[PDB]
């Protein structure tokens, strides 16, 4: 039995930690909703 608990508001935070890269990837999406890499 699953339940939900509030965790916060949805708002843009000014001066948040900025991280992560921006890769451009060729992918495929199967009928089961799974993404895979296409080479």
């Amino acid at each position: 039995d699953m339940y939900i608990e509030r965790a916060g508001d949805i708002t843009w935070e000014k001066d948040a930690e900025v991280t992560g890269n921006s890769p451009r990837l060729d992918v495929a999406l199967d009928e089961s909703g799974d993404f895979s890499l296409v080479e």
Partner: protein, 156 residues
């Protein structure tokens, strides 16, 4: 139960202790999460019950109490924020410039940020605070790193 707009953890008592299996967004009275978090099961909110209303395994999305309400889209240029809600940890905003998933049916934005599986369903936001998609369905690239699609539904 609690119907206030916002971000929520999705918990279960089935396994050892209380375990966070995902996250979701309550907006306009509807709860939105990824299909792989709930597998379409009903949810509890305090004393109330939320029943699935719409879902699709291929999009990997599900809405409860009503139709999918989130319609904002990544503009393809701007930085966005993942409002990550990790298990046992406080909600935190992380700003990033999305990459791209290129498919035979078009391109989708993607965020290269690595969080535990129980963070699936955490919303990705634009500068106006609008939810442009949910985090948690993606791929593991060459170096073992995780890249999630910016998954968005359709508002009928």
């Amino acid at each position: 139960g609690e119907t206030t707009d916002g971000v929520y953890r999705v918990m279960t008592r089935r396994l050892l202790g209380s375990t966070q299996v995902g996250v979701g967004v309550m907006q306009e009275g509807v709860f939105h999460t990824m299909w792989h978090v709930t597998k379409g099961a009903a949810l509890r909110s305090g004393e109330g019950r939320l029943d699935p209303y719409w879902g699709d395994v291929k999009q990997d999305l599900v809405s409860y109490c009503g139709p999918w309400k989130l319609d904002a889209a990544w503009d393809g240029l701007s930085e966005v924020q993942l409002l990550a809600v990790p298990p046992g940890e406080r909600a935190k905003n992380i700003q990033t410039l999305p990459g791209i998933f290129k498919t035979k049916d078009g391109d989708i934005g993607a965020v290269a940020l690595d969080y535990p599986a129980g963070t699936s369903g955490s919303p990705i936001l634009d500068k106006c605070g609008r939810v442009i998609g949910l985090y948690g369905n993606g791929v593991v690239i060459k170096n073992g790193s995780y890249v999630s699609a910016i998954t968005q539904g359709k508002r009928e």
